[PDB]
Design a protein around this motif. Structure first.
Motif, PDB file in Angstrom:
ATOM      1  N   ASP A   4     -58.801 -35.952 -18.082  1.00  0.00           N
ATOM      2  CA  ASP A   4     -59.027 -35.813 -19.518  1.00  0.00           C
ATOM      3  C   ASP A   4     -60.503 -35.624 -19.847  1.00  0.00           C
ATOM      4  O   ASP A   4     -60.854 -34.831 -20.719  1.00  0.00           O
ATOM      5  N   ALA A   5     -61.356 -36.365 -19.147  1.00  0.00           N
ATOM      6  CA  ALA A   5     -62.797 -36.273 -19.354  1.00  0.00           C
ATOM      7  C   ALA A   5     -63.319 -34.883 -19.017  1.00  0.00           C
ATOM      8  O   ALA A   5     -64.146 -34.328 -19.746  1.00  0.00           O
ATOM      9  N   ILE A   6     -62.824 -34.317 -17.915  1.00  0.00           N
ATOM     10  CA  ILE A   6     -63.216 -32.974 -17.495  1.00  0.00           C
ATOM     11  C   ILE A   6     -62.821 -31.954 -18.560  1.00  0.00           C
ATOM     12  O   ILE A   6     -63.618 -31.095 -18.945  1.00  0.00           O
TER      13      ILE A   6
ATOM     14  N   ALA B  63     -56.485 -21.504 -21.831  1.00  0.00           N
ATOM     15  CA  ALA B  63     -57.314 -21.871 -20.682  1.00  0.00           C
ATOM     16  C   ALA B  63     -57.272 -23.382 -20.475  1.00  0.00           C
ATOM     17  O   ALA B  63     -57.230 -23.866 -19.344  1.00  0.00           O
ATOM     18  N   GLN B  64     -57.284 -24.127 -21.573  1.00  0.00           N
ATOM     19  CA  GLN B  64     -57.157 -25.575 -21.497  1.00  0.00           C
ATOM     20  C   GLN B  64     -55.806 -25.966 -20.904  1.00  0.00           C
ATOM     21  O   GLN B  64     -55.725 -26.894 -20.106  1.00  0.00           O
ATOM     22  N   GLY B  65     -54.753 -25.250 -21.285  1.00  0.00           N
ATOM     23  CA  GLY B  65     -53.441 -25.491 -20.704  1.00  0.00           C
ATOM     24  C   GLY B  65     -53.420 -25.236 -19.208  1.00  0.00           C
ATOM     25  O   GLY B  65     -52.827 -25.999 -18.443  1.00  0.00           O
ATOM     26  N   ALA B  66     -54.088 -24.168 -18.784  1.00  0.00           N
ATOM     27  CA  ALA B  66     -54.173 -23.816 -17.371  1.00  0.00           C
ATOM     28  C   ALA B  66     -54.896 -24.904 -16.581  1.00  0.00           C
ATOM     29  O   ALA B  66     -54.431 -25.335 -15.524  1.00  0.00           O
ATOM     30  N   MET B  67     -56.036 -25.355 -17.097  1.00  0.00           N
ATOM     31  CA  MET B  67     -56.776 -26.423 -16.432  1.00  0.00           C
ATOM     32  C   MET B  67     -55.980 -27.732 -16.405  1.00  0.00           C
ATOM     33  O   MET B  67     -56.027 -28.475 -15.424  1.00  0.00           O
ATOM     34  N   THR B  68     -55.268 -28.023 -17.485  1.00  0.00           N
ATOM     35  CA  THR B  68     -54.398 -29.193 -17.522  1.00  0.00           C
ATOM     36  C   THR B  68     -53.378 -29.129 -16.383  1.00  0.00           C
ATOM     37  O   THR B  68     -53.174 -30.110 -15.659  1.00  0.00           O
TER      38      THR B  68
ATOM     39  N   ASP C   1     -50.970 -16.578 -11.410  1.00  0.00           N
ATOM     40  CA  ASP C   1     -52.251 -15.986 -11.048  1.00  0.00           C
ATOM     41  C   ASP C   1     -53.200 -15.986 -12.237  1.00  0.00           C
ATOM     42  O   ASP C   1     -54.397 -16.253 -12.094  1.00  0.00           O
ATOM     43  N   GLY C   2     -52.653 -15.698 -13.412  1.00  0.00           N
ATOM     44  CA  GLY C   2     -53.440 -15.670 -14.630  1.00  0.00           C
ATOM     45  C   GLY C   2     -53.984 -17.037 -14.983  1.00  0.00           C
ATOM     46  O   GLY C   2     -55.112 -17.163 -15.459  1.00  0.00           O
ATOM     47  N   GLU C   3     -53.176 -18.068 -14.758  1.00  0.00           N
ATOM     48  CA  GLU C   3     -53.611 -19.434 -15.007  1.00  0.00           C
ATOM     49  C   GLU C   3     -54.742 -19.816 -14.057  1.00  0.00           C
ATOM     50  O   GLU C   3     -55.742 -20.389 -14.491  1.00  0.00           O
ATOM     51  N   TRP C   4     -54.620 -19.480 -12.774  1.00  0.00           N
ATOM     52  CA  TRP C   4     -55.716 -19.780 -11.852  1.00  0.00           C
ATOM     53  C   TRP C   4     -56.978 -19.016 -12.241  1.00  0.00           C
ATOM     54  O   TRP C   4     -58.081 -19.531 -12.091  1.00  0.00           O
ATOM     55  N   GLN C   5     -56.829 -17.797 -12.761  1.00  0.00           N
ATOM     56  CA  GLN C   5     -58.014 -17.027 -13.220  1.00  0.00           C
ATOM     57  C   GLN C   5     -58.729 -17.758 -14.351  1.00  0.00           C
ATOM     58  O   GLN C   5     -59.889 -17.836 -14.359  1.00  0.00           O
TER      59      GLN C   5
ATOM     60  N   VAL D  99     -65.129 -32.289 -21.615  1.00  0.00           N
ATOM     61  CA  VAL D  99     -66.473 -31.767 -21.394  1.00  0.00           C
ATOM     62  C   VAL D  99     -66.468 -30.241 -21.350  1.00  0.00           C
ATOM     63  O   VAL D  99     -67.363 -29.603 -21.907  1.00  0.00           O
ATOM     64  N   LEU D 100     -65.452 -29.656 -20.724  1.00  0.00           N
ATOM     65  CA  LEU D 100     -65.363 -28.200 -20.676  1.00  0.00           C
ATOM     66  C   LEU D 100     -65.159 -27.613 -22.070  1.00  0.00           C
ATOM     67  O   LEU D 100     -65.749 -26.588 -22.405  1.00  0.00           O
ATOM     68  N   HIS D 101     -64.337 -28.260 -22.889  1.00  0.00           N
ATOM     69  CA  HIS D 101     -64.120 -27.794 -24.255  1.00  0.00           C
ATOM     70  C   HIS D 101     -65.409 -27.899 -25.070  1.00  0.00           C
ATOM     71  O   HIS D 101     -65.726 -27.009 -25.856  1.00  0.00           O
ATOM     72  N   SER D 102     -66.156 -28.977 -24.865  1.00  0.00           N
ATOM     73  CA  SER D 102     -67.396 -29.199 -25.600  1.00  0.00           C
ATOM     74  C   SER D 102     -68.486 -28.193 -25.237  1.00  0.00           C
ATOM     75  O   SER D 102     -69.176 -27.676 -26.116  1.00  0.00           O
TER      76      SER D 102
END
Ligand code: HEM
Length: 153
Positions: free
Chosen positions: A109-111, A127-132, A4-8, A114-117
């Motif tokens: 990877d592109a997404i 959060a990057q791990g969750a999105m991955t 749940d935390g990862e989806w958040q 861009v989100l990190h940038s």
């Protein structure tokens, strides 16, 4: 696959996307096309675009960016129960446009790039791990549908 935390964390950063979805979509596609020019060949509308500068000036590319992130957003917001939203996308990208799973990894990877940038304060390491993980779930479920559809991806 995600807690749940990862989806958040996924939905939190995605909220930042919705404030300028066209701009985000544009940047994602340009990152994809410049990093992996073979992907550009899939787009009859865009493969004439030779350079990043030409891509940036394309209204049609920006509009398609909006279409892509709108569809992805709808899928992400369904969290782990995304099959109904994912179904038509897998179908179109296995028939009308045959898109290999590798290219879906490239755009994933592109997404993330861009989100990190653009939103580093909402996209730290976890959060990057969750999105991955979310984009891995996305690709895995598309791949499963591809096979049913007779596309080896
Ligand atoms: C996050 C991943 C992706 C999402 C959410 C997405 C979404 C979409 C959507 C909503 C459309 C329009 C309706 C449809 O045909 O389903 C579309 C069209 C298209 N997609 Fe994707 N797509 C993704 C990845 C890719 C990738 C990686 C490629 C190629 C390397 C690709 C190639 C195309 C092409 C060629 C079209 C038609 C464009 C046109 O009409 O000119 N897609 N995509």
């Amino acid at each position: 696959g995600l807690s749940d935390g990862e989806w958040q964390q996924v939905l939190n950063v995605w909220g930042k996307v919705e404030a300028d979805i066209a701009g985000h979509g544009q940047e994602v596609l340009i990152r994809l096309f410049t990093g992996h020019p073979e992907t550009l060949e899939k787009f009859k509308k865009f493969k004439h675009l030779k350079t990043e500068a030409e891509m940036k000036a394309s209204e049609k590319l920006k509009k398609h960016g909006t279409v892509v992130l709108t569809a992805l957003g709808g899928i992400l917001k369904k969290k782990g129960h995304h099959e109904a939203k994912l179904k038509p996308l897998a179908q179109s990208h296995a028939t009308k446009h045959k898109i290999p799973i590798k290219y879906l990894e490239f755009i994933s990877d592109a997404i993330i790039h861009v989100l990190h940038s653009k939103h580093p304060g909402d996209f730290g390491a976890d959060a990057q791990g969750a999105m991955t993980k979310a984009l891995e779930l996305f690709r895995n479920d598309i791949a499963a549908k591809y096979k049913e559809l007779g596309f080896q991806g």
